[PDB]
Amino acid sequence: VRHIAIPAHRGLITDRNGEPLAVSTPVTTLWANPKELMTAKERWPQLAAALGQDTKLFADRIEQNAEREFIYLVRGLTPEQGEGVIALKVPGVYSIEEFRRFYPAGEVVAHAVGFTDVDDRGREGIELAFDEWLAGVPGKRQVLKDRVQVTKNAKPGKTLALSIDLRLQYLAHRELRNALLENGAKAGSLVIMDVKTGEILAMTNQPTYNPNNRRNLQPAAMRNRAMIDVFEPGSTVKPFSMSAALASGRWKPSDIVDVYPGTLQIGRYTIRDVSRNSRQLDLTGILIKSSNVGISKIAFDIGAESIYSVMQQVGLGQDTGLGFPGERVGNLPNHRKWPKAETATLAYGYGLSVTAIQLAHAYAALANDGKSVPLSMTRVDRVPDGVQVISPEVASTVQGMLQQVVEAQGGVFRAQVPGYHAAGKSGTARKNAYRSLFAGFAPATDPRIAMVVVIDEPSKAGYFGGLVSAPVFSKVMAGALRLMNVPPDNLPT
Ligand SMILES: *C(=O)[C@H]([C@@H](C)O)[C@H]1CC(SCCNC=N)=C(C(=O)O)N1
């Protein structure tokens, strides 16, 4: 009517290596002044036909808007398409240069990147989180009519390079989908983090969607599971309980706990081990055998406050600071005083709720010699100092224990990575809905990458983390380490 905005070119989103992920592409939008269109009714049917619109629906739309001075006819046409309609010389019909987003990697990085709405505003993912950086500033065209000027130029948005490595993202996406098909699972997540920089190198969820064509789309495919699915992490948090034990000054890895007969009565409750073939276990054995009894006895000795503190410091149930739309925090209840039942359940991971992103970040702190670096979804050039949350001595010790969980007899052999020493822990998460988990990092002797694999479980009162998720970790870690040119560390001493 008086002012019409001049859309600004929205900033390009690339992966960390400059591969295109969200591109602002010029498109031609047609608009009309219904007051002038109302004087040329005989041209409407050819215009409706050129637009592929029903003659009656098109005429009713003009008639109902007869007193308006601006209505869109069609948005997002190619420059070639706009020219053909303009050549008809229909009174009151005008072409406007607009920008429309295209997502070259499509479904492979759908949830991380997100998308823009009809007006080119960030709606999901990075598009929304970094909307101010990406959007730039629109210009203005003053239109004066009976009873055109450029006022303020358009400024383009800014390019953004994500932390995601499209090569690792594609490998993760492919392997997670393979694993889901193999096990008859319908949903899952896989997160890969650079332990040194806090960068999220890959974040894939299944099911996924093509952001280039969002009509039809089931809302389950829209779910950014890695950041929104909250669950009790179970056995995957035992390394944090062990970190508290080694930091207490009361436990060395060679110390023994008698877990026989794989049950422990605490008043009215019975703590039970899934695998009940042990008597004395050292601290590494407690992790290899995933003994709830062993971890609970240690937890009683050191107190739940020490375990709570380690979990809180590594970020379990805490804000990530990413500012990512829809990201959930979960909950790590600070009971202040914990009875035995609550102490045990916390120690073996059923007394808190976390996300896959949080679990990966906690494993990244352990892998990075106990130093937590803040999470980033954008490329990190200057690494922040981070915080020493676990002492380097304790983190080094727990790293060795987790390498034994993968490599020792009776360990999670399916998680072994050929050419490298790998470390990690399997578990069954609870939401009752279940998930099979594997969390770990590699190379075990000089860690570079941390990864969490979550596969949603149809299940039957079973524990499949070491069967379903561990092989995904093996394949994705091997490919990721090779893609990053990490030297193999399993060499003759
Ligand atoms: C952890 O998630 C549970 C805990 C809460 O009971 C455990 C039980 C099992 S399965 C038997 C493993 N024993 C030795 N080979 C696991 C696991 O995934 O290893 N975690």
UniProtKB/TrEMBL annotation:
Active site (catalytic residues): 235
Membrane topology: Single-pass membrane protein
EC number: 3.4.16.4
Gene3D superfamilies: 3.30.450.330, DD-peptidase/beta-lactamase superfamily, Penicillin-binding protein 2a (Domain 2)
Residue intervals of the Penicillin-binding protein dimerisation domain: 6-147
Main location: membrane
Involved pathway(s): Cell wall biogenesis; peptidoglycan biosynthesis
GO biological process, one term: peptidoglycan biosynthetic process
Keywords for this protein: Carboxypeptidase, Cell cycle, Cell division, Cell inner membrane, Cell membrane, Cell shape, Cell wall biogenesis/degradation, Glycosyltransferase, Hydrolase, Membrane, Peptidoglycan synthesis, Protease, Septation, Transferase, Transmembrane, Transmembrane helix
A molecular function GO annotation: serine-type D-Ala-D-Ala carboxypeptidase activity
InterPro entries: Beta-lactam/transpept, Beta-lactam/transpept-like, FtsI_transpept, PBP_dimer, PBP_dimer_sf, PCN-bd_Tpept
Annotated Penicillin-binding protein transpeptidase domain residues: 188-477
Location(s) in or outside the cell: Cell inner membrane
Gene Ontology CC annotations of this record: plasma membrane
Catalytic activity: Preferential cleavage: (Ac)2-L-Lys-D-Ala-|-D-Ala. Also transpeptidation of peptidyl-alanyl moieties that are N-acyl substituents of D-alanine
Similarity annotation: Belongs to the transpeptidase family. FtsI subfamily.
Function: Catalyzes cross-linking of the peptidoglycan cell wall at the division septum.
Name this protein carries in UniProt: Peptidoglycan D,D-transpeptidase FtsI
Source species: Pseudomonas aeruginosa
